Amino acid sequence: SMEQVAMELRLTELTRLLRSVLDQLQDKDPARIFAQPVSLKEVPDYLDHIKHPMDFATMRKRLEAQGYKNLHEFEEDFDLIIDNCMKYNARDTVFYRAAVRLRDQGGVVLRQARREVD
Ligand SMILES: CNC(=O)c1cc2cccnc2s1
């Protein structure tokens, strides 16, 4: 149907917009602290602490699979990255401070993405 095609076109362009947003957000993490899943080899008990792990690479995989239906779902995943980090790591760590900076600096980027979506 033309309708299903039209939807897939919207979804494809949403994916295109979110891809840009993802690249911008990841630029706010120059140290690549949030680039990959927390290694269960380097941190074997992590899953006892964090029930829903998230990272930029995992977000990217979902993105290219067009697994984000709207911005809210995308923001959910970004928020997990930040919130997980700030629970697992203590306040006076390079990890926690990185999350804070990503949170603050990403707020700008998501504020406009929200408008560009409507
Ligand atoms: C988002 N990444 C984290 O919260 C990490 C925490 C720790 C702790 C020790 C060694 N490596 C890592 S990575």
Swiss-Prot record:
Localization, UniProt: Nucleus; Chromosome
What superkingdom heads the lineage?
Eukaryota
Annotated Bromo domain ranges read 9-113
Location in chain, cross-link Glycyl lysine isopeptide (Lys-Gly) (interchain with G-Cter in SUMO2): 41
Expression across tissues is:
Highly expressed in testis.
This molecule's function is given as: Scaffold subunit of various histone acetyltransferase (HAT) complexes, such as the MOZ/MORF and HBO1 complexes, that acts as a regulator of hematopoiesis. Plays a key role in HBO1 complex by directing KAT7/HBO1 specificity towards histone H3 'Lys-14' acetylation (H3K14ac), thereby promoting erythroid differentiation.
How does this protein assemble? Component of some HBO1 complex composed of KAT7/HBO1, MEAF6, ING4 and BRD1/BRPF2. Component of the MOZ/MORF complex composed at least of ING5, KAT6A, KAT6B, MEAF6 and one of BRPF1, BRD1/BRPF2 and BRPF3. Interacts (via PHD-type zinc finger domain) with unmodified histone H3. Interacts (via PWWP domain) with dimethylated and trimethylated 'Lys-79' on histone H3.
Please state what the protein is called. Bromodomain-containing protein 1
Q: Which residues of the full protein are shown?
A: 555 to 671 of 1058
